[PDB]
């Protein structure tokens, strides 16, 4: 009973049903609310509130008897959002150097020649290829800053909540200088305006409009660069294909052979192997593979290096690792077992 008497004084002070906001009229507050389950409503406010902060994508206090608007806050928040080896793909970091580094170093080549600074890139390539590494490998030279954002993190079940996190990311971006948010799975974020008379997946729609608004147009970017990752330039918008926003389209695909030797260097140096072995034979054994699968190969040679007590990996450890992954774990073991060839 540490506060029991005051609890017998709050019984005449009780208000404010949850009631998320759909939208409003114009010229006036005149908002529109669904409660949860019943119906819809075209509401108006109580007088002692701020009609400013009753904006769309919010859940306000609402009276029982008059449904008049009381004080909001964001009642849906915080759990909502989950480089020495610079040199992976080759022709890519140089175009990365261009579109990122050259506006962030000099407005000398750009404004004087009469062009606008290229500010955004459409990365495209298969997954497991190092979009994350090149993205973060930008952040050695800027200052140190990076944030990572998967697209389907914004799949949360309230209207404009993803747009609210667009608000959050763009008002964290301008707090800091020379920073890097990263984008990925930008198809579910939306590039195509699919519509018929259904009214469904619309938080994506208004969040994507919020994305076009805060991205480019109405106080542009400055010392903020954001890469967008995909397998397709096919499911995007012609409003960010507005030709001065995302105009480079850096290309890469599976590495050649020597790229895989470089990734062999990378995931050989960062673990316990022996420094007397080669990798080009293993590079021949990987005609189509990813550096993520090179990580799997190196961790599997580490699994053999667990099997026997090995901290100095032989060539045979990586031999049986590749033999494990590409021929004895590609599906089972028995695509070989015939000569006809040798």
Partner 1 sequence: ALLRSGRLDRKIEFPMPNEEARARIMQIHSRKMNVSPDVNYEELARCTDDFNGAQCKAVCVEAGMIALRRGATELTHEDYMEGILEVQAKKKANLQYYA
Partner 2 sequence: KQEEERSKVDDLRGTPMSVGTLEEIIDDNHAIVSTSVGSEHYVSILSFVDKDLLEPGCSVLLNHKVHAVIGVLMDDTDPLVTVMKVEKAPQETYADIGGLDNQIQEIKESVELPLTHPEYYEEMGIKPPKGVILYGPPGTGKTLLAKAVANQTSATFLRVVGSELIQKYLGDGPKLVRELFRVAEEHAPSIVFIDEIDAIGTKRYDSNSGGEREIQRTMLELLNQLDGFDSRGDVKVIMATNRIETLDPALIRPGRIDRKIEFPLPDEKTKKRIFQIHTSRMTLADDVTLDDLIMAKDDLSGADIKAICTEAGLMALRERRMKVTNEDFKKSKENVLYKKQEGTPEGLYL
Ligand X SMILES: Nc1ncnc2c1ncn2[C@@H]1O[C@H](COP(=O)(O)OP(=O)(O)OP(O)(O)=S)[C@@H](O)[C@H]1O
Report the binding-site residues for ATP: 125-132
Q: Which stretch binds partner 1 (CB under 8 A): 45-53, 111-119, 291-299, 314-322?
A: 111-119
Residue 247 found at the interface with partner 1 (CB under 8 A): yes
Residues numbered 301-340 forming contacts with partner 2, rule: CB under 8 A: 302-303, 305-307, 311, 329, 332
Residue 48 found at the interface with partner 2 (CB under 8 A): no
d(CA 90, CA 104): 21
- Name which position in 44, 55, 63, 98 contacts partner 1 (CB under 8 A): 98
Closer residue to ligand X (CB): 24 or 155: 155
Position with the least CB separation from ligand X: 291
User: According to the 3-state scheme, what is the secondary structure of 184-246?
Assistant: CCCCCCCCCCCCCCCCCCCHHHHHHHHHHHHHCCCCCCCCEEEEECCCCCCCCCCCCCCCCCE
- Which residues sit opposite 70 in a β-bridge? 61
339 is in the binding site of which of ligand X, partner 1, partner 2, none (Cβ under 5 to 8 A by kind)? none
Residue 109 found at the interface with partner 1 (CB under 8 A): yes
Using a 10 angstrom Cβ sphere, with 0-12 exposed, 13-18 middle and 19 or more buried, the burial of residue 306 is exposed
Tell me the DSSP string of 11-75: TT-------BEEEE-SSS--EEEE-SSS-EEE----SSS-STT--SS-B-EE-SSS--EE----S
243 is in the binding site of which of partner 2, ligand X, partner 1, none (Cβ under 5 to 8 A by kind)? partner 1
d(CA 215, CA 167): 11
Q: Specify whether the CB–CB gap between 5 and 13 falls below 8 A.
A: no
Closer residue to partner 1 (CB): 94 or 195: 94
Residue 263 found at the interface with ligand X (CB under 6 A): yes
User: Who contacts 36 (Cβ-Cβ below 8 Å, separation ≥6)?
Assistant: 18, 19, 20
Residue 88 found at the interface with ligand X (CB under 6 A): yes
Q: Specify whether the CB–CB gap between 292 and 125 falls below 8 A.
A: no
Closer residue to partner 1 (CB): 55 or 98: 98
Residue 179: how many other CB atoms lie within 10 Å: 20
- Name which position in 104, 169, 179, 229 contacts ligand X (CB under 6 A): 229
Question: What CA dihedral angle connects 203, 205, 207 and 210, to 10 degrees?
Answer: -140
3-state secondary structure of 183: strand
Task: Map residues 57-96 to x or -, x wherever contact with partner 1 holds by CB under 8 A.
Answer: ----------------------------------------
Task: Map residues 277-306 to x or -, x wherever contact with ligand X holds by CB under 6 A.
Answer: -------------xxx--x-----------
261 is in the binding site of which of partner 1, ligand X, partner 2, none (Cβ under 5 to 8 A by kind)? none
Q: Which residues bind partner 2 (CB under 8 A)?
A: 1-4, 7-8, 10-11, 14-18, 35-37, 61, 64, 75-79, 82, 270-272, 292, 299, 302-303, 305-307, 311, 329, 332
Q: Which residues bind partner 1 (CB under 8 A)?
A: 98, 102, 109, 112-115, 243, 247
């Amino acid at each position: 009973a540490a506060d029991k008497q005051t609890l017998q004084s709050e019984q005449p002070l009780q208000v404010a049903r949850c009631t998320k906001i759909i939208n409003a009229d114009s010229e006036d507050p005149k908002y529109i609310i669904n409660v949860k389950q019943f119906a819809k409503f075209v509401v108006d406010l109580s007088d002692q509130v701020a009609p400013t902060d009753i904006e769309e994508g919010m859940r306000v206090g609402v009276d029982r008897n008059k449904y008049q608007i009381h004080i909001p806050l964001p009642p849906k928040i915080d759990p909502t959002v989950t480089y020495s080896d610079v040199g992976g793909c080759k022709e890519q970091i140089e175009k990365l150097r261009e579109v990122v580094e050259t506006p962030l170093l000099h407005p000398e080549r750009f404004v004087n020649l009469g062009i606008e600074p290229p500010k955004g890139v459409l990365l495209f390539g298969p997954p497991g290829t190092g979009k994350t590494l090149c993205a973060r490998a930008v952040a050695n030279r800027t200052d140190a800053c990076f944030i990572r954002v998967i697209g389907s993190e914004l799949v949360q079940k309230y209207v404009g909540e993803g747009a609210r996190m667009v608000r959050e990311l763009f008002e964290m971006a301008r707090t800091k200088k020379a920073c890097l948010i990263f984008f990925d799975e930008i198809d579910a974020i939306g590039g195509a305006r699919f519509d018929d008379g259904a009214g469904g997946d619309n938080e994506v729609q208004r969040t994507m409009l919020e994305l076009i608004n805060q991205l480019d147009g109405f106080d542009p970017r400055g010392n903020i660069k954001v890469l967008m990752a995909t397998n397709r330039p096919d499911t995007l918008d012609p409003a960010l294909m507005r030709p001065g926003r995302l105009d480079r389209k850096i290309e890469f695909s599976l590495p050649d052979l020597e790229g895989r030797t470089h990734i062999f260097k990378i995931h050989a140096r960062s673990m316990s192997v022996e420094r007397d072995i080669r990798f080009e034979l293993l590079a021949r054994l990987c005609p189509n593979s990813t550096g993520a699968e090179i990580r799997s190969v190196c961790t599997e040679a580490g699994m053999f290096a667990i099997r026997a007590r090995r901290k100095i990996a032989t060539e045979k450890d990586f031999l049986e690792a590749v033999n494990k992954v590409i021929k004895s774990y590609a599906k089972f073991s028995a695509t070989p077992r015939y000569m006809t060839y040798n």
